[PDB]
Design a protein around this ligand. Structure first.
Ligand SMILES: [K+]
Ligand SMILES: [K+]
Ligand SMILES: [K+]
Ligand SMILES: [K+]
Lengths: 259, 259, 259, 259
C-alpha cells in the first residue's frame, strides 16, 4: 500500500504536508528552468576584452549547465517516482502528462550523448526548442490549463475543420494573389507558397506589410481575402468558447457539489 | 436500373466497395492536381547553365502537363459518368457541383484549343487561376464544406447587406480621407479609388502601413474609420455564426435520429 | 387630398406605378451622383501636350458640372415636392431624412454663391466632402440602412460610454507611451497628442507600424495597450449587435404579421 | 450630525445644490488638470530667437505650475473634507477612491520636496506619468466607469488565467521564433525576450511589421502564433462581457425598482 500512498500523494497534493512541499518544489523548479532557458539567450553586454556580445548561456555556460542538470535530475527523479509508484503503469505511461514529462526530460540526455559534436547546429537547436516543453509541466499545477487542454480535446473536430477550411482558403487566395501579383516589379509574390505568407497574414488581420499588393486586382483580392478570413476564422471560435465555458462551469458545479 | 445503381453509388459512397474506391481515387486525384498546381510555381533553383531560376512547371513542363492531363481525364470521365447515369439530367446539370466540375474541367480544354498562342499572358493567367476551382471538388468529400456552403446560401441576405454597408462606408471614408490627405507631400491618396485601399485595410484592422495618414484630420478620420469598420463588420457575423452552428447541429440531430 | 395622395406616394413607393418610377429614378440619380463624385478624382492619364496628369473632374469640368447640376435639380425638386406636399411640414422638416436631403443639396448652391473665389481651397474641399452625404439618401431606399440607423439611435448610451472609455484609455496610454518613448532617437512620440495616434492604432489592433515603440517600457505598455483596447472595444459591441438583431427580427415578425 | 450631513452630500450629489455645485466644480477641475497635463507636452512652434521648439509646459512653465497647483489644492481640500467628515475613516481610507485620490495628489507634493533637483529625469518622468491617475477621479462622476471597475474586480480570476495563458504562449512562441530566426541576416530576434515583442504583437493581430519572420519555419510558427493568440485571447472575453452586461443590467433593474 506504500505505492498507492505515494500515488495518492502525487495525484492529490493537498493531503499531506510532504506531498504539498514536493508539489511546490516541483513547481518552483519548473519555473526556474523555464526562466533560465529564456534568460540564457540574453546578451551579457561586452566582456573585458570581448569583440562582440555573448549570451548569458555562453558567458556562463558552466553555471547554466549546472542549473539545467539540477532541474533535470529533479524532473527525472519525480518522473521515476511517479512511474514505479503508480497502480497501473501502462495507464500512467500512456497518460498525457507522462509524455509531457518524458519530452521535457529526454532532450537533456540526448544532448549528453551528443556531447562529441555540440558546435554543430541542427539537432542542437531542435533540443533547445524542445526544452520549452517543460512549461507544459505547469499543467499539473494549473487547473485552468487542464481546462484548456480538455476543451482543446473536446473541439478536435471543430479545430480540424478550421484547419481544413483555412488550408483551402490559403490555397485559393495564394493562387489568386500570386497570379495577380507575379508581374509586379520586385514582386514578393514569387510563387504560390510565397503567397501563403501574405494570405495567412491577411486573413488573420495581422497586416505586417512586408508583402502588400501593388496591383488593382491584388488590392481587390486582398480585400476579399481579409473579409473571408475573418468569417472563416470566426466559425469555430464560438463553439470553442462555448466548450471552454461549459467545462469551466461544469467543474465549478462539481466543486460546489462536493464542497 | 443500371443508371440508378450508378447514381446511388456516386451519391452514396459507403454502399459498395467499388463506389468507395472510386470516391477515394477521385479525392486523391483532386489532392494531387491541387498540389501540383501549387508546386509548379516554385523555382527549381538554378539549372546547369541557366541564367535565372525557372519554376517547377517550366523546367519540367512535360511532366506537369502529363500529370494535369491525367487528372483532367479522370475528372471528365467521372463527370460524364455522373451525367449519363443520373435519373434527372437537368437537375444534375443545374446542380451546383456540376457547375463546379465543369469549371474545373473546361480551362484545360480551352487551353488545348488555344495552343497556337500560349506565350501570351492574359487568358493564360485566367485559365491558370481557374484551375484552382478543382479544390471546390473536395466539397463532395467534406461534410463541413457542404455545411459552409449551406450557411453561405442561408445568409445571402445578410451577406448582401454587409456588402452594401461596406460599400457605403468605403465610399464615405475614402472621400473623407482623400480630401483630407490629397495635399500631403508624396501622398498615396491620389484619388478616392486609391483611398478605397486605405479604407478597406483600415476597417478590417489589417494595418499594412503602405498607406498611412500624415495629417491631423487624416489621423482623426482614420481612427473613426477603424472603429466604424469594426462595428459594421461585426453586424452580420453573429447571424452567420448562428446559422452555421444551427446547420451543423441540425445535421448532428439528423445523424443521431437515423443512427 | 392631393397633398396627402402625394405624401402616400412618396412615403410608400409600391402603391402606384408613378410613385415607383419616381422612387427608382431618384435612386438611380443618387447612384449616378455618388459614382460621378468618386470618379472625378481619378486622373485621366496624360492629355496631348499636358505636363502632368489631370483628374476626370478637371479635364472635363463642364461635363461633370452638368451632371452634378442635373442631379442637384432632381434632388431639390424631389425635396420641394416632399416639403410642400406633406401633412405636417414641421414634422417633415425636423425629420432626419429632411436634414439629410438639405445637407446633400445645399453644398451645391453654396458653391454657386462662392463662384467668385473657387481656386482657393478650404471651404471648397469642405463642400466637396459634404457632397458625399448624398449616399445617405440611399437610406430611403435600403431597409437595412434604416435598421442600422435605428440601432445606432437605440445604442446611443452604449456608444457614448464607449467613446468615454476610449477617450480615457487613449489619454492614459498616450501619456504613458509619450513619457516612456520621448527619449528615443528620432522619436515619433513628440507629444501626448502625437501618441494619441499610436494609442488608437494599437488599441484597435491595426498596427500600421508608422509609430512603434523602441524602448522596453514602450514595448510593455504597448502590449498592455493592445490587450486593454481589445477588452474596452469589445464591451459595447455585443449590446450593439443584440440591438441590431433585435430590430431586424422585430421587423421580420412585423412583416410576417401583416403579410 | 454635521459630519454625516457632509458625508451624505459628498456620497450623493443630487441632494442639495451646494453638493451639486461642489460635485460639478470638482469634475470641471479634474477635466482641466487632465487637459493641461496633456497640452503642456505640445510644442509652441518657435519662439522669437529660439533655436528649437519648446513645449507648452516649458515656454509657459509658471502658468502651468499655477494651474496645476490650483487643481491640486482643490483636490486636496476635497480629499481632506472627505476624510475628516466621514463616519468610518478606516473604511474611507481603505476605499479604492481614497487611494485614487492620494495617488492623484501626492506626486505634486513629492515634486515640491524634490525641487532641489528638477532637471534630472527618472523620478521626474515617473511623477509626470503618475499625474494621469487624476483621470481615474472621473470614476466618481461616471457610472459606467464604476461598472467597468466592478466587472474588472468580478473577473479577477478570468483575467489572471488570461495573463497566465498569455505568458505561457508568449514564452513558447518566443522560444520557437527566436531559435527559428536567430540565424537570419540582421535579425531582430536577438534573444527570446526580444521575440516577446514579436509574439505579443502577433497574437493580438497587430502586425506592426517592425519584426517579421524571414525564414520558412519563422513563417509557419508566426502563422500558428497568430491563430493560437486569437483563440487564447478569445477565451475570457465572453465571460468578461457577460459580467459587464450583467452588472449594467442589474443596475438598470435596481434603478427601475427604486424608481
Ligand atoms: K492588424
Ligand atoms: K486585427
Ligand atoms: K498591421
Ligand atoms: K504594418
Amino acid at each position: 500500500t506504500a505505492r498507492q500512498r505515494v500515488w495518492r500523494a502525487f495525484e492529490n497534493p493537498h493531503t499531506s504536508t510532504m506531498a504539498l512541499v514536493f508539489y511546490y518544489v516541483t513547481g518552483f523548479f519548473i519555473a526556474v528552468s523555464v526562466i533560465a532557458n529564456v534568460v540564457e539567450t540574453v546578451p551579457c553586454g561586452s566582456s573585458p576584452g570581448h569583440i562582440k556580445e555573448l549570451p548569458c548561456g555562453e558567458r556562463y555556460a558552466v553555471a547554466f549547465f549546472c542549473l539545467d542538470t539540477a532541474c533535470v535530475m529533479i524532473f527525472t527523479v519525480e518522473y521515476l517516482l511517479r512511474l514505479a509508484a503508480a497502480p497501473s503503469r501502462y495507464r500512467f505511461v500512456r497518460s498525457v502528462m507522462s509524455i509531457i514529462d518524458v519530452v521535457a526530460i529526454l532532450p537533456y540526455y540526448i544532448g549528453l550523448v551528443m556531447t562529441d559534436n555540440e558546435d554543430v547546429s541542427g539537432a542542437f537547436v531542435t533540443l533547445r526548442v524542445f526544452r520549452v516543453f517543460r512549461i507544459f509541466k505547469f499543467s499539473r499545477h494549473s487547473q485552468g490549463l487542464r481546462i484548456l487542454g480538455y476543451t482543446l480535446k473536446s473541439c478536435a473536430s471543430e479545430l480540424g475543420f478550421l484547419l481544413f477550411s483555412l488550408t483551402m482558403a490559403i490555397i485559393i487566395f495564394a493562387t489568386v494573389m500570386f497570379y495577380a501579383e507575379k508581374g509586379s516589379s520586385a514582386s514578393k509574390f514569387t510563387s504560390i507558397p510565397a503567397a501563403f505568407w501574405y494570405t495567412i497574414v491577411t486573413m488573420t488581420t495581422l497586416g505586417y506589410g512586408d508583402m502588400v499588393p501593388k496591383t488593382i486586382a491584388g488590392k481587390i483580392f486582398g480585400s476579399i481575402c481579409s473579409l473571408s478570413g475573418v468569417l472563416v476564422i470566426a466559425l469555430p471560435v464560438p463553439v470553442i468558447v462555448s466548450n471552454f465555458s461549459r467545462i469551466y462551469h461544469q467543474n465549478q458545479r462539481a466543486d460546489k457539489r462536493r464542497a
